[PDB]
RNA sequence: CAAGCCGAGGAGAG
RNA sequence: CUCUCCUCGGCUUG
RNA sequence: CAAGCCGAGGAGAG
RNA sequence: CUCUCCUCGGCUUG
């Protein structure tokens, strides 16, 4: 209910009715400023007897829920009506009179965008920006290119231009709400010179229609006293050992490569090798030539294992290989539950003729890992010095890496002795080759991390922003560097004086250089903002108008082309990737809800096999996987109206046309230019 | 970390603070001397508590990356901060505080030149030479005329002259860094007498501000014992056969020539013929008279084929012709996808009425090639004598030649039997009529050549310098002689005792004489250096000062004229070269980023045809070629802001003016004196 | 809690 | 422009 | 990985 | 001074 002088100095111009942006460090009380501004604006509008509505837009459901339940509701419930929406709630069914029913709204931009789309094209009641008097946008740095924030503000700018036109012609013009953006680091984007950073900042300002930035410039000492930066540390690790297992991997790779008389132009263990393997497997699948598709797939698996070994223990890679190979053996045995294919035979024999030696080599404390030893030392020093008063975050690139680090931590008793309780955290996307984490589990782990029964976190890029996390004492980056904004957000985590920020990496990689470049970009952005804050109003307004007009017109020009697919379902046929054979046509495939592709015919039922659901394995089995006779996966099982149907994935097939047959693969249904009919139950019924 | 006595004797004067040059053979440890000198200089400056910064300038990104990752970083990382920059990295965004952040810098001269230009004219922070204490320039022989090295050292000399002036007037003068140049052969340039070589060496010294040369003069025996020169061999090949195919080429050439009643003043198969053909085609295109432009173009193609045959197999020339003719037929058929032009008709018929006989003649082991037989014998003898312990390099003039040699090698089983694994290597410039090689592929082939799975290389002038190559046993020059410096660099490749250097050529050409002249220049340069090393300091300094003053003043005088183009876009019109017709005007042409010329109008869209991208052909097609109705190419396709636009090449057009119309062709946009407007999306929009 | 569909952003390699 | 990795949002069948 | 722009150096022929 | 061949660097659109 009360603000600090450094908060007040930045908030004042907003209190005067000027739309602006506010860039403050992490944890400096931006939400406090937002709530105070909303209260003041509502009171001032009520004094004049004018309609007052305020809407807050965020990009995460968890953020909206937290802000409503902890910050906004407890402060304005006594005076105004507050509501918080998201995609997980049932209030969004009728949004327009959600709006007129309540005064303060917190939500995600997509809901309001959908309402606008319904109004402009749909027959629903719809909603307009004029219904609002104040719009708050947190994490405003995301307003770029064609994000939802950018679309909303594009509509706002179009309305502003229409009002400017109407100024000379009929009056009055359409009123527009005030705009308040919140952030900590707007970034520089792809900037290689100071002028590029200046242009990027001006573009952000024009997109958000900002009068100025209002960065702290007077109470710097008080702010620094309060929020204090950690000390930065670099850990560099080098090695010229760990030969045996890697050499064994390399020589088996050479054996498999010379089996197919294919010597790639690239070396082993690099992304270029993976790309070449993907290209070769794709070409082999298109041509239907076996003995190369599987070879490329196994080479890709070996490359992934080598990368994993380059980052973490050898047992992790061994586990990866054994999981893949055991799955293949189980699939083959289930199919055989006879003619074999020699290629899979020699591949399996090669893997199993050296499984024991690989396992023996993997267990060798002689050369385990330099980076892991450095991380062990860092964690132990920090925690032993904190006398049980420390908390830590570790940012890592991948998910399997998080699992490996967590289990590794639990296998060592020193972490428990010092009092270390670690947990992992990942995203919620089903497009990462691994079972994602659910929102409930994320909130739940965050809650226990807040309590303290969990000491340290092993998190992917989820944890930089949008999460309510108590200040930690140690921040670690395990070979992960993305950009300056993520760097700043991770750095701001290290409050709790006597906290430190460390980046651990090796010499071969260029991670340190990327971190340095991010630092350079930080200073470039600071200088750009410093210059921009002192620019003359006239030229500032001129350039903002120019940028807004250019953005709107280029959006118009780009949308012009988007108007643009012949429908010949019977023209195409589907072939299994490994065993090229006629699977089905485009006539037997039907669509449910225009979204689910399913084939429901008698003969097709006997062309596949059903397995158990591994996700539910670790009860009942509902969505079983679908595998081919060769062992190739086609899709899964679904139930519609209580009826069991198969759902297919286009990426598991090859398309053949009857006109000229340039067989092609589309990776998803939408890219397929042909249409499919909606389900008709008359076929194979009554 | 430790030096040899011959290295020490040359390094000592540098250790005393004297700027100098150092000329040593190839592979004698120049980088070792450089790193030791940098370490000693940094330590000595730190002893006196003085600012110390060292910058190394190179001319190739690969060289900088290699030097940083293999030589400098592993030796000074334990004491000093080392950084390596290039045009392929993101650290160059803010160079000045790259400089103050780090102590040791490795980079390409262009970056520092750009920083200086920004400081002197731009508003950026900028950089000055005074910020450095030591400047190392490798491959210093390139510092001549107006290379980047020469510009930097011109600035250095101007600063020195200003300091000399200020000596009598206000003091102190501006400090300057020490200068250390590295090379192996500074060369003689265009020298025809000993005095000319002396003048050239003095000019190089003055440009680099060198106290002396410091060439090895005492430990000659130890150096010779270590690095040993190969034995030089000349292979001369003569022939009075291979008539049929060449005579058939000549008689078809005569037929086409007498079709147009044009008997050139020159003979067939010489550069003078190609020049005359280019002049005739240019005049015909300017006059718009068809039946001569295409005739000249086909005559030029036949001349190129005859040259190729003069160097390599006949099938290579046959492939060249069939590629061109098949492309023409495909273009015509795609256009027709009707009125024909009799000229192309009889040309095509003439080509196709003898395709089979040409193919039959090309396959004839009776007379294949004398030079190729000699090369076969040389390679076989070397490799059979090396019992699988040899590596080889072959320097060839052109790229198609490298491809032909490589494929020829793979067609013969004797090379495989002896254990020969060959690979090719070319440059990375898109101005050689052939798709260039990329940097990644160059590094990658070099890596495998280092490993050994690739035995011999077929390389153009890329491989003489700037590449990390393990010593080879055989060096071959296949009819290629450029200058003494390239000769010395190629010769130095032949370490690995029992290595040999051979030049293969015929009697008609004057290649042997050019090689002999290069040897003469080598001895002339040696004598010039020997005299210069013994010159009296006073006259040496006097002449160096005179040369520096003369160079700076002539640069001033030349820059004076460079101050100097009316803008009448609507004045000109563009005509297709083959079919002279109104294509467009200078008003419908717009410019993107001041660099890309594009025409975006409705009527223009229907005036051209789109083909597939051959580079991507051997997926998706993004930059398709643009062809005319007559089959003439105009340009390609580009995408800006997601919008498909055509990009035109001026060399495919003829310019017509409305005042007096002296139609002219410019070969590139910059030479065109008129300006063009920047893209404005308002036209044909909204 | 499981399956599927669409769209968006960031990094790296080519 | 392509591939990979990572994140986010909305929508359906259960 | 594709396209385009600018500039520099070396050789040969004229 | 012109033409061709070869090499290099920097910068944009993707
Ligand atoms: N007026 C205030 N006086 C004292 N502490 C405050 C005040 N406002 C906020 N804080 C502190 O700041 C924290 C809230 O910061 P918050 O706004 O959530 O961070 P951010 O601005 O980075 O989102 C609270 O934990 C609280 O301790
Ligand atoms: N002090 C030394 N003792 C022994 N060998 C050395 C020494 N310094 C360099 N070398 C040899 O010289 C090579 C490095 O030469 P380098 O300086 O790269 O060649 P150049 O001077 O032609 O660039 C290495 O392969 C190494 O074997
Ligand atoms: F918005 Al913050 F830490 F910067 F919650
Ligand atoms: F500089 Al060298 F061989 F002469 F690398
Ligand atoms: Zn199958
Ligand atoms: Zn034409």
Residue A435 CA to residue A638 CA, distance in Å, equals 19
Ligand lying closest to the C-alpha of residue B464: 4
Residue B611 CA to residue A23 CA, distance in Å, equals 51
- For residues B630-658, b (16+ Cβ closer than 10 Å) or e, as one string? bbbbbbbbeeeeeeebbbbebebbbbbee
Q: Which chain A residues are within 8 Å of B125, Cβ to Cβ? A: 194
Q: With CB atoms and an 8 Å threshold, state whether A557 touches B641.
A: yes
Q: Which nucleotide is nearest to B615 (CA to C1')?
A: E2
Three-state DSSP at A149 gives helix
A145 in contact with chain B, both atoms CB, cutoff 8 A? no
**A85, A73 contact by CB (below 8 A):** no
Ligand lying closest to the C-alpha of residue A470: 1
Rounded to whole angstroms, the distance from the CA of residue B597 to the C1' of nucleotide E5 is 10
> In chain A, what is the straight-line distance between the N-terminal and C-terminal CA atoms, in Å?
70
> In chain B, what is the straight-line distance between the N-terminal and C-terminal CA atoms, in Å?
70
A517 in contact with chain B, both atoms CB, cutoff 8 A? yes
Sequence-distant (6+) residues with CB within 8 A of B315 are B362, B363
**B490, B163 contact by CB (below 8 A):** no
For B390, other C-beta atoms within 10 Å of its C-beta total 22
Reference A477, options A518, A430, A515; nearest CA is: A515
Q: Find the helix or strand (DSSP H, E) in which B35 lies.
A: helix B30-47
Residue B552 CA to residue A183 CA, distance in Å, equals 53
B447 in contact with chain A, both atoms CB, cutoff 8 A? yes
Phi, psi of A236 (to 5 degrees): -115, 130
**A463, A395 contact by CB (below 8 A):** yes
For A183, the token pair is 């952030």
Sequence-distant (6+) residues with CB within 8 A of B282 are B665
Q: With CB atoms and an 8 Å threshold, state whether A520 touches B94.
A: yes
**B456, B386 contact by CB (below 8 A):** no
Put the strands of the sheet holding A104-108 in their side by side order: A20-23, A178-183, A134-138, A54-58, A104-108, A82-84
B140 within ligand 4 shell (Cβ under 6 A)? no
For A392, the token pair is 């830590």
CA B645 centroid distance within chain: 32
With the most atoms of ligand 3 within 8 angstroms of its CB, the residue from A30, A59, A446, A485 to mutate is: A30
Looking from the CA of B11 toward its CB, the CA atoms found within 13 Å total 20
Three-state DSSP at A84 gives strand
Residue A653 CA to residue A650 CA, distance in Å, equals 5
For the CA atoms of chain B, what is the radius of gyration? 29
Residue B9 CA to residue B222 CA, distance in Å, equals 13
Phi, psi of B299 (to 5 degrees): -60, -40
Q: Which nucleotide is nearest to B486 (CA to C1')?
A: E10
Q: Are strands B609-610 and B178-183 parallel, antiparallel or unpaired?
A: unpaired
Q: What is the resolution of this structure in A?
A: 3.9
Q: Which chain A residues are within 8 Å of B643, Cβ to Cβ? A: 557-558, 561
CA B650 centroid distance within chain: 24
């Amino acid at each position: 209910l009360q603000l600090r002088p450094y908060q007040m100095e930045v908030a004042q111009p907003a209190l005067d009715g000027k739309n602006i942006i506010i860039c403050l460090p992490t944890g400096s009380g931006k939400t406090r400023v937002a709530v105070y501004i909303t209260k003041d604006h509502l009171d001032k509008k009520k004094q004049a007897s004018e309609s007052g509505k305020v809407i807050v837009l965020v990009n995460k459901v968890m953020l909206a829920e937290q802000l409503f339940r902890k910050e906004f509701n407890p402060y304005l419930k006594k005076w105004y009506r507050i509501i918080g929406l998201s995609g997980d709630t049932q209030l969004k069914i009728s949004f327009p009179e959600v709006v007129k029913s309540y005064d303060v709204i917190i939500s995600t931009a997509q809901i309001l965008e959908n309402s606008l789309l319904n109004l402009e094209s749909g027959d629903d009641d719809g909603v307009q920006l004029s219904d609002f008097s104040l719009i708050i946008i947190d994490e405003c740095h995301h307003t770029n290119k064609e994000a939802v924030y950018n679309n909303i503000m594009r509509r706002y700018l179009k309305q502003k231009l229409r009002n400017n036109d109407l100024k000379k012609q009929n009056k009055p013009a359409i009123p527009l709400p005030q705009i308040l953006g919140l952030t900590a680091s707007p970034g520089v984007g792809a900037a290689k010179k100071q002028s590029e950073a200046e242009k990027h900042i001006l573009n952000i300002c024009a997109n958000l229609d900002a009068f100025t930035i209002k960065t702290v410039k007077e109470n710097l000492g008080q702010l620094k006293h309060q929020i204090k930066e950690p000390c930065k540390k670099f850990v560099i690790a080098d090695d010229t050992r760990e030969n045996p297992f890697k050499e064994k991997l390399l020589e088996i790779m050479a054996s498999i490569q010379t089996y197919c008389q294919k010597s790639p132009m690239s070396d082993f263990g690099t992304q270029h090798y993976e790309q070449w393997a993907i290209q070769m497997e794709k070409k082999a699948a298109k041509d239907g030539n076996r003995k190369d598709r599987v070879c490329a797939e196994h080479l890709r698996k070996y490359n992934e294992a080598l990368q994993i070994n380059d980052t973490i223990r050898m047992i992790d890679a061994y586990s990866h290989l054994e999981t893949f190979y055991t799955d293949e053996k189980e699939k083959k045995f289930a199919v055989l539950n006879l003619k074999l294919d020699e290629t899979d035979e020699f591949l399996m024999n090669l893997f199993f003729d050296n499984k024991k030696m690989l396992k023996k080599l993997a267990e060798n404390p002689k050369y385990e890992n330099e980076k892991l030893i450095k991380l062990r030392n860092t964690i132990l020093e920090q925690f032993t010095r904190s006398e049980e008063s420390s908390r830590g975050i570790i940012f890592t690139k991948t998910r399997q890496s998080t699992y490996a680090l967590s289990q590794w931590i639990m296998e060592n008793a020193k972490f428990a002795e010092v009092g270390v309780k670690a947990h992992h955290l990942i995203g919620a996307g089903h497009s990462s080759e691994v079972k994602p984490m659910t929102q409930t589990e994320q909130k739940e782990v965050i809650s226990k991390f807040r309590t303290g029964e969990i000491n340290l976190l092993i998190a992917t890029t989820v944890a930089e922003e949008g999460l309510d996390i108590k200040e930690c004492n140690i921040v670690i980056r395990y070979g992960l560097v993305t950009n300056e904004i993520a760097m700043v957000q991770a750095r701001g985590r290290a409050r709790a004086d006597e906290s430190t920020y460390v980046l651990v990496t090796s010499s071969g990689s260029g991670v340190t250089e990327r971190e340095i470049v991010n630092d350079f970009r930080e200073k470039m952005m600071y200088k750009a903002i410093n210059r921009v804050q002192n620019m003359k109003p006239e030229e500032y307004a001129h350039k903002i108008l120019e940028l807004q007009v250019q953005s709107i017109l280029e959006k118009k020009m780009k949308v012009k082309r988007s108007i643009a697919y012949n429908d010949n379902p019977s023209l195409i046929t589907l072939l299994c990737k490994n065993c090229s054979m006629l699977v089905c046509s485009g006539e037997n495939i039907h669509v449910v809800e225009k979204m689910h592709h399913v084939n429901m015919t008698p003969e097709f039922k006997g062309l596949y096999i059903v397995r158990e659901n591994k996700a539910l394995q670790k009860d009942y089995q509902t969505n079983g996987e679908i595998i081919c006779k060769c062992g190739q996966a086609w899709g899964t099982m679904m139930v519609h109206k209580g009826l069991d149907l198969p759902c297919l994935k286009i990426r598991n097939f090859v398309v053949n046309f009857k006109n000229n047959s340039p067989k092609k693969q589309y990776k998803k249904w939408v890219e397929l230019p042909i249409r499919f009919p909606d389900l008709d139950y008359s076929e194979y019924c009554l």
